[PDB]
Coordinates of C-alpha atoms and ligand atoms in Angstrom, one line a residue:
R5 CA -110.4 -5.4 -148.4
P6 CA -111.1 -3.5 -145.1
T7 CA -109.3 -0.3 -144.2
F8 CA -106.8 -0.9 -141.4
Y9 CA -105.5 1.5 -138.8
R10 CA -102.5 1.4 -136.5
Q11 CA -102.7 1.8 -132.7
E12 CA -100.3 0.9 -129.8
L13 CA -101.4 -1.8 -127.4
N14 CA -99.7 -4.3 -125.1
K15 CA -96.2 -3.2 -126.2
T16 CA -97.0 -4.0 -129.8
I17 CA -98.6 -2.3 -132.9
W18 CA -102.1 -3.6 -133.7
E19 CA -103.3 -3.1 -137.2
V20 CA -107.1 -3.7 -137.3
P21 CA -110.0 -3.1 -139.6
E22 CA -111.7 0.2 -138.7
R23 CA -115.1 -1.5 -137.8
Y24 CA -113.4 -2.6 -134.6
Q25 CA -113.5 0.2 -132.1
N26 CA -112.5 0.9 -128.4
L27 CA -109.8 -1.8 -128.2
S28 CA -109.1 -2.4 -124.5
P29 CA -106.6 -5.0 -123.2
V30 CA -108.3 -7.7 -121.0
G31 CA -105.5 -10.2 -120.6
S32 CA -102.0 -10.6 -122.2
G36 CA -100.2 -13.2 -127.9
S37 CA -102.8 -10.9 -126.3
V38 CA -106.5 -10.0 -126.2
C39 CA -108.4 -6.8 -126.3
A40 CA -112.1 -6.3 -125.8
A41 CA -113.7 -4.2 -128.5
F42 CA -116.9 -3.0 -130.1
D43 CA -117.7 -4.2 -133.6
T44 CA -119.4 -1.2 -135.3
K45 CA -120.4 -3.3 -138.3
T46 CA -122.3 -6.1 -136.4
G47 CA -123.1 -4.2 -133.1
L48 CA -121.4 -7.0 -131.1
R49 CA -118.9 -6.7 -128.3
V50 CA -115.8 -8.8 -129.5
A51 CA -112.5 -10.1 -128.2
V52 CA -109.6 -9.3 -130.6
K53 CA -106.6 -11.6 -130.2
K54 CA -103.3 -10.7 -131.8
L55 CA -101.0 -13.8 -132.0
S56 CA -97.5 -13.0 -130.8
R57 CA -94.8 -14.0 -133.3
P58 CA -97.0 -16.7 -134.8
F59 CA -94.3 -17.9 -137.1
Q60 CA -91.1 -17.5 -134.9
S61 CA -90.6 -21.3 -134.6
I62 CA -92.1 -24.7 -135.4
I63 CA -94.0 -24.8 -132.1
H64 CA -95.4 -21.2 -132.6
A65 CA -96.4 -21.9 -136.2
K66 CA -98.3 -25.1 -135.3
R67 CA -99.9 -23.5 -132.3
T68 CA -101.2 -20.7 -134.6
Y69 CA -102.5 -23.2 -137.2
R70 CA -104.3 -25.3 -134.5
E71 CA -106.1 -22.5 -132.7
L72 CA -107.2 -21.1 -136.1
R73 CA -108.4 -24.6 -137.2
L74 CA -110.2 -25.3 -134.0
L75 CA -111.9 -21.9 -134.0
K76 CA -113.0 -22.2 -137.6
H77 CA -114.6 -25.6 -136.8
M78 CA -116.7 -24.7 -133.8
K79 CA -120.2 -23.7 -134.6
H80 CA -122.1 -24.1 -131.4
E81 CA -124.1 -21.8 -129.1
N82 CA -122.0 -22.8 -126.0
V83 CA -118.6 -22.9 -127.6
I84 CA -116.5 -19.9 -128.7
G85 CA -116.4 -19.4 -132.5
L86 CA -114.6 -17.2 -135.0
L87 CA -116.4 -14.0 -136.0
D88 CA -113.4 -12.9 -138.1
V89 CA -109.8 -13.6 -138.8
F90 CA -107.6 -11.0 -140.5
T91 CA -104.1 -10.0 -141.6
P92 CA -102.6 -6.7 -142.8
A93 CA -100.5 -8.9 -145.1
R94 CA -101.5 -8.6 -148.8
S95 CA -99.6 -11.8 -149.8
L96 CA -98.2 -15.0 -148.3
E97 CA -94.6 -13.6 -148.3
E98 CA -95.6 -10.3 -146.5
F99 CA -97.7 -12.6 -144.1
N100 CA -96.5 -12.3 -140.5
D101 CA -99.4 -11.3 -138.3
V102 CA -102.6 -13.0 -137.4
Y103 CA -105.7 -11.6 -135.5
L104 CA -108.7 -13.6 -134.3
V105 CA -112.2 -12.1 -133.6
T106 CA -114.5 -13.8 -131.1
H107 CA -117.7 -13.0 -129.1
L108 CA -117.0 -11.1 -125.9
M109 CA -119.6 -12.5 -123.6
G110 CA -118.6 -10.0 -121.0
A111 CA -117.5 -12.0 -118.0
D112 CA -115.9 -15.3 -117.0
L113 CA -117.3 -17.8 -114.5
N114 CA -115.0 -16.4 -111.8
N115 CA -117.0 -13.1 -111.9
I116 CA -120.1 -15.1 -110.8
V117 CA -118.8 -17.6 -108.2
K118 CA -117.9 -14.5 -106.2
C119 CA -117.4 -17.0 -103.3
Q120 CA -121.2 -17.2 -103.1
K121 CA -123.5 -20.2 -103.3
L122 CA -125.4 -20.0 -106.6
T123 CA -128.9 -21.4 -106.4
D124 CA -129.6 -24.9 -107.6
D125 CA -131.7 -23.5 -110.5
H126 CA -128.8 -21.4 -111.6
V127 CA -126.3 -24.3 -111.3
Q128 CA -128.6 -26.4 -113.4
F129 CA -128.7 -23.9 -116.2
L130 CA -125.0 -23.1 -116.0
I131 CA -123.8 -26.7 -115.9
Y132 CA -126.3 -27.8 -118.6
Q133 CA -124.7 -25.4 -121.0
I134 CA -121.1 -26.5 -120.2
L135 CA -122.1 -30.1 -120.7
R136 CA -124.0 -29.2 -124.0
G137 CA -120.9 -27.4 -125.3
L138 CA -118.6 -30.3 -124.2
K139 CA -120.9 -32.9 -126.0
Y140 CA -120.2 -31.0 -129.2
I141 CA -116.5 -30.6 -128.7
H142 CA -116.1 -34.2 -127.6
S143 CA -118.2 -35.3 -130.7
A144 CA -115.4 -33.9 -132.8
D145 CA -112.7 -35.8 -130.9
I146 CA -111.3 -32.8 -129.2
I147 CA -110.4 -32.8 -125.5
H148 CA -110.3 -29.4 -123.7
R149 CA -107.7 -30.5 -121.1
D150 CA -107.9 -27.3 -119.0
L151 CA -111.5 -26.5 -118.4
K152 CA -112.0 -24.1 -115.4
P153 CA -114.1 -21.0 -114.5
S154 CA -111.6 -18.8 -116.3
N155 CA -112.4 -20.5 -119.6
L156 CA -116.1 -20.1 -119.2
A157 CA -117.5 -16.9 -120.8
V158 CA -120.9 -15.6 -119.7
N159 CA -123.1 -12.6 -120.6
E160 CA -125.7 -10.7 -118.5
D161 CA -128.4 -13.4 -119.2
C162 CA -125.9 -16.0 -118.1
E163 CA -125.4 -17.4 -121.7
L164 CA -122.2 -19.5 -121.4
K165 CA -119.4 -20.1 -124.0
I166 CA -116.5 -22.5 -123.5
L167 CA -113.1 -21.1 -124.6
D168 CA -109.4 -22.1 -124.8
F169 CA -109.6 -25.8 -125.8
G170 CA -106.7 -27.5 -127.8
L171 CA -104.4 -30.5 -128.2
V183 CA -107.1 -18.3 -108.3
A184 CA -105.1 -21.4 -109.1
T185 CA -104.9 -22.8 -112.6
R186 CA -104.6 -26.5 -111.5
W187 CA -107.6 -26.9 -109.1
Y188 CA -109.9 -28.3 -111.9
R189 CA -107.4 -30.6 -113.7
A190 CA -108.2 -34.3 -113.9
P191 CA -105.7 -36.3 -111.7
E192 CA -104.4 -38.4 -114.6
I193 CA -103.5 -35.1 -116.5
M194 CA -101.3 -34.1 -113.5
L195 CA -99.6 -37.4 -113.5
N196 CA -98.2 -37.5 -117.0
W197 CA -100.5 -40.3 -117.9
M198 CA -99.5 -41.5 -121.4
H199 CA -103.0 -41.1 -122.9
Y200 CA -106.3 -39.4 -122.0
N201 CA -110.0 -39.8 -122.6
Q202 CA -112.7 -37.2 -122.9
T203 CA -113.7 -37.7 -119.3
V204 CA -110.8 -35.5 -118.2
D205 CA -113.1 -32.6 -118.9
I206 CA -115.9 -34.2 -116.9
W207 CA -113.7 -34.2 -113.8
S208 CA -113.3 -30.4 -114.4
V209 CA -117.1 -30.0 -114.7
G210 CA -117.5 -31.8 -111.3
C211 CA -115.0 -29.4 -109.8
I212 CA -116.8 -26.4 -111.2
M213 CA -120.3 -27.6 -110.4
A214 CA -119.2 -28.4 -106.8
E215 CA -117.8 -24.9 -106.3
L216 CA -121.0 -23.3 -107.7
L217 CA -123.2 -25.1 -105.2
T218 CA -120.9 -24.6 -102.3
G219 CA -119.2 -21.3 -103.2
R220 CA -115.9 -22.9 -102.4
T221 CA -113.0 -24.5 -104.3
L222 CA -113.5 -28.3 -104.1
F223 CA -109.7 -29.2 -104.2
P224 CA -107.7 -26.0 -103.4
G225 CA -104.3 -27.7 -103.6
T226 CA -101.2 -25.6 -102.5
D227 CA -99.0 -27.6 -105.0
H228 CA -99.0 -30.7 -107.1
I229 CA -98.7 -33.3 -104.3
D230 CA -101.2 -31.4 -102.0
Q231 CA -103.7 -31.3 -104.8
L232 CA -103.4 -35.1 -105.3
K233 CA -103.8 -35.7 -101.5
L234 CA -106.9 -33.5 -101.2
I235 CA -108.4 -35.6 -104.1
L236 CA -107.7 -39.0 -102.6
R237 CA -109.3 -37.7 -99.3
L238 CA -112.7 -37.0 -100.9
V239 CA -112.9 -39.7 -103.5
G240 CA -110.8 -42.2 -101.5
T241 CA -107.9 -44.7 -102.4
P242 CA -108.1 -46.5 -105.7
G243 CA -110.3 -49.7 -105.6
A244 CA -109.1 -53.0 -107.0
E245 CA -110.6 -52.4 -110.5
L246 CA -108.5 -49.2 -110.9
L247 CA -105.4 -50.6 -109.2
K248 CA -105.1 -53.2 -112.0
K249 CA -104.8 -50.3 -114.4
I250 CA -101.7 -48.8 -112.7
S251 CA -98.5 -50.6 -113.8
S252 CA -95.9 -49.4 -111.2
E253 CA -95.8 -51.3 -107.9
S254 CA -93.8 -48.5 -106.4
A255 CA -96.4 -45.9 -107.5
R256 CA -99.2 -48.0 -105.9
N257 CA -97.0 -48.3 -102.7
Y258 CA -96.5 -44.6 -102.9
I259 CA -100.2 -43.7 -103.3
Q260 CA -101.1 -46.2 -100.5
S261 CA -98.5 -44.5 -98.2
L262 CA -101.1 -41.6 -98.3
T263 CA -103.5 -43.1 -95.6
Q264 CA -105.2 -45.7 -97.9
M265 CA -108.8 -44.8 -96.7
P266 CA -112.1 -45.6 -98.5
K267 CA -114.2 -43.0 -100.4
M268 CA -115.9 -40.3 -98.4
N269 CA -119.7 -40.7 -99.0
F270 CA -120.1 -37.3 -100.8
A271 CA -122.5 -35.6 -98.6
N272 CA -120.5 -33.7 -95.9
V273 CA -119.3 -31.3 -98.6
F274 CA -122.7 -30.9 -100.3
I275 CA -124.9 -30.5 -97.2
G276 CA -128.3 -29.0 -98.2
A277 CA -127.8 -29.7 -101.9
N278 CA -130.4 -31.1 -104.3
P279 CA -129.9 -34.9 -104.0
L280 CA -130.0 -35.1 -107.8
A281 CA -127.0 -32.7 -107.9
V282 CA -125.1 -34.8 -105.5
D283 CA -125.9 -37.9 -107.5
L284 CA -124.5 -36.2 -110.6
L285 CA -121.3 -35.0 -108.9
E286 CA -120.7 -38.6 -107.6
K287 CA -120.8 -39.8 -111.3
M288 CA -118.4 -37.1 -112.5
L289 CA -115.9 -37.2 -109.7
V290 CA -114.8 -40.8 -110.1
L291 CA -111.0 -41.3 -110.0
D292 CA -111.1 -44.0 -112.8
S293 CA -111.8 -42.0 -115.9
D294 CA -113.4 -45.1 -117.6
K295 CA -116.1 -44.9 -115.0
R296 CA -117.1 -41.2 -115.2
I297 CA -120.4 -40.2 -116.8
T298 CA -119.9 -38.8 -120.4
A299 CA -121.3 -35.4 -121.5
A300 CA -124.2 -36.9 -123.4
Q301 CA -125.1 -39.3 -120.5
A302 CA -125.0 -36.4 -118.0
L303 CA -127.4 -34.4 -120.3
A304 CA -130.1 -37.1 -119.8
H305 CA -129.6 -37.2 -116.0
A306 CA -132.8 -36.2 -114.2
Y307 CA -131.0 -33.1 -112.7
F308 CA -131.4 -31.4 -116.1
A309 CA -135.1 -32.3 -116.8
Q310 CA -136.1 -28.6 -116.9
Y311 CA -133.5 -27.9 -119.7
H312 CA -132.8 -31.2 -121.4
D313 CA -134.0 -31.4 -125.0
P314 CA -132.6 -34.4 -126.9
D315 CA -133.1 -32.7 -130.3
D316 CA -131.3 -29.5 -129.5
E317 CA -128.0 -30.9 -128.2
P318 CA -126.0 -30.7 -131.4
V319 CA -123.1 -32.7 -132.4
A320 CA -120.1 -31.5 -134.4
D321 CA -119.0 -32.2 -138.0
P322 CA -116.0 -34.5 -138.0
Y323 CA -112.7 -32.6 -137.5
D324 CA -109.6 -33.3 -139.6
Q325 CA -106.9 -33.3 -136.9
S326 CA -104.3 -35.2 -138.8
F327 CA -102.0 -32.1 -138.6
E328 CA -101.8 -32.9 -134.9
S329 CA -99.3 -35.8 -135.5
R330 CA -97.2 -34.0 -138.1
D331 CA -93.7 -32.6 -137.6
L332 CA -93.4 -30.0 -140.4
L333 CA -91.3 -27.0 -141.4
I334 CA -92.4 -23.4 -140.5
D335 CA -93.0 -22.4 -144.0
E336 CA -95.5 -25.2 -144.3
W337 CA -97.4 -24.3 -141.1
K338 CA -97.3 -20.7 -142.4
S339 CA -98.7 -21.5 -145.8
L340 CA -101.3 -23.8 -144.2
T341 CA -102.4 -21.0 -141.8
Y342 CA -102.5 -18.4 -144.6
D343 CA -104.9 -20.6 -146.7
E344 CA -107.2 -20.9 -143.7
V345 CA -107.2 -17.1 -143.4
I346 CA -108.0 -16.4 -147.1
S347 CA -110.8 -19.0 -147.2
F348 CA -112.6 -17.6 -144.1
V349 CA -116.3 -17.0 -144.4
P350 CA -118.0 -15.2 -141.5
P351 CA -121.3 -16.4 -139.9
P352 CA -124.2 -14.6 -141.7
Ligands
048_401 O1 -110.5 -19.5 -126.9 C1 -109.5 -19.4 -127.7 N1 -109.0 -18.3 -128.2 C2 -109.4 -17.1 -127.9 C3 -109.7 -16.7 -126.6 C4 -110.1 -15.3 -126.4 N2 -110.3 -14.9 -125.1 C5 -111.4 -14.4 -124.5 C6 -112.6 -14.2 -125.3 C7 -113.7 -13.6 -124.6 C8 -113.6 -13.4 -123.2 C9 -112.4 -13.6 -122.5 C10 -111.3 -14.2 -123.2 C11 -112.1 -13.4 -121.0 C12 -112.6 -12.1 -120.4 C13 -114.2 -12.2 -120.3 C14 -114.9 -11.7 -121.6 C15 -114.9 -12.8 -122.6 O2 -116.0 -13.3 -123.0 C16 -110.2 -14.5 -127.5 C17 -109.9 -14.9 -128.8 C18 -109.5 -16.2 -129.0 F1 -109.3 -16.6 -130.2 C19 -108.9 -20.8 -128.1 C20 -109.7 -21.8 -128.6 C21 -109.1 -23.0 -129.0 C22 -107.7 -23.1 -128.9 C23 -106.9 -22.1 -128.4 C24 -107.5 -20.9 -128.0
BOG402 C1 -103.3 -40.3 -107.2 C2 -104.3 -41.3 -107.8 C3 -104.8 -40.8 -109.1 C4 -104.6 -41.8 -110.2 C5 -106.0 -42.1 -110.7 C6 -106.2 -41.6 -112.1 C7 -107.0 -42.6 -112.9 C8 -107.4 -42.1 -114.3 O1 -108.2 -43.1 -114.9 C9 -107.4 -43.8 -115.9 O2 -107.1 -42.9 -117.0 C10 -106.6 -43.6 -118.2 C11 -106.9 -42.6 -119.3 O3 -106.1 -41.4 -119.0 C12 -107.3 -44.9 -118.6 O4 -106.5 -45.6 -119.5 C13 -107.5 -45.8 -117.4 O5 -108.4 -46.8 -117.8 C14 -108.3 -45.0 -116.3 O6 -108.5 -45.8 -115.1
BOG403 C1 -98.5 -38.8 -105.9 C2 -99.2 -40.1 -106.0 C3 -98.3 -41.0 -106.9 C4 -99.1 -41.2 -108.2 C5 -98.6 -42.4 -109.0 C6 -99.4 -42.7 -110.2 C7 -98.5 -43.0 -111.4 C8 -99.3 -43.5 -112.6 O1 -98.4 -43.6 -113.7 C9 -99.0 -43.8 -114.9 O2 -99.6 -45.1 -115.0 C10 -100.1 -45.4 -116.2 C11 -100.6 -46.9 -116.0 O3 -99.5 -47.7 -115.5 C12 -99.1 -45.4 -117.4 O4 -99.7 -45.6 -118.6 C13 -98.3 -44.0 -117.4 O5 -97.2 -44.2 -118.2 C14 -97.9 -43.6 -116.0 O6 -97.6 -42.2 -116.0

């Protein structure tokens, strides 16, 4: 058992193993950047806030723990450590999670500057490679955006924050429109949004609200064709969407003037309204735009993921006990 020490951060008391040093709040549970004197790594230390206050908190806590334990991929955030001061299940009330701190997010690079095509290749290849792994385990991210893309100095990229500035500029349209159900291509829409911005230096759909965002999207990728219209039940919703100028798809060049034609071709395959018609992560990895980086025997897939818990409505003491067993059984990466 590690030796713990108390320290006051983000209006709470952190109680952390003494190997973790220089805890400094990054965002607000809440996260501190730190140095791990035992491994030599820079690490993000997240303290969950009242993880067992309610059913929703308790299940949130269990899910993030579970998802973090599962991910073992170069381009996806993984668990370095998880710890509790608690010496038993009954004393158990606090949860901390330790993660790589890559150093910056993908906002800190966009900088409103055109990245080169070469750099966009390398950056998008990694996102796609990470997504392939996540999607192979039946997990949809649902809110992929530059903020959730961690990079280091060498531009190594890790995807973070993926469970069951404006924070809606990258969201698939169906996600905004309370669509009963979602496929994995919701994240591919996000990729197209991010890729587009890296090449142009500019937000692709900078909506001012919900309805604006939707209008900006119909402007670039046009009014739903007949194949997609058949998949929308409401006649009043169709009438409503068609009351927004009902014009055909823009050709996808005027935005991406000067871009690699292969990049443009990829963005056209990502940024399809009909989610059934978007390129998948694995398909996009084979697209000629990634020829310099694509290696079919180094694009790992995930072990299958037991997400049964996801459909369960359980009592707190069950989520708590389930979480605690996940803590006690944790093995760090060698
Ligand atoms: O990412 C999940 N949880 C999680 C997120 C963090 N957050 C960060 C880590 C590193 C960095 C940054 C934030 C941003 C500042 C730039 C440096 C950097 O690199 C820390 C610890 C965690 F546990 C997650 C995963 C699945 C479901 C729910 C949440
Ligand atoms: C404002 C116009 C936006 C509406 C277009 C969103 C289309 C999303 O695509 C739809 O998503 C569903 C999965 O979520 C699938 O069941 C449908 O087959 C697919 O067409
Ligand atoms: C602002 C533009 C109006 C968007 C109207 C789109 C409403 C889509 O509505 C969605 O259609 C799906 C297929 O019928 C259903 O499965 C979902 O229940 C429903 O939310």
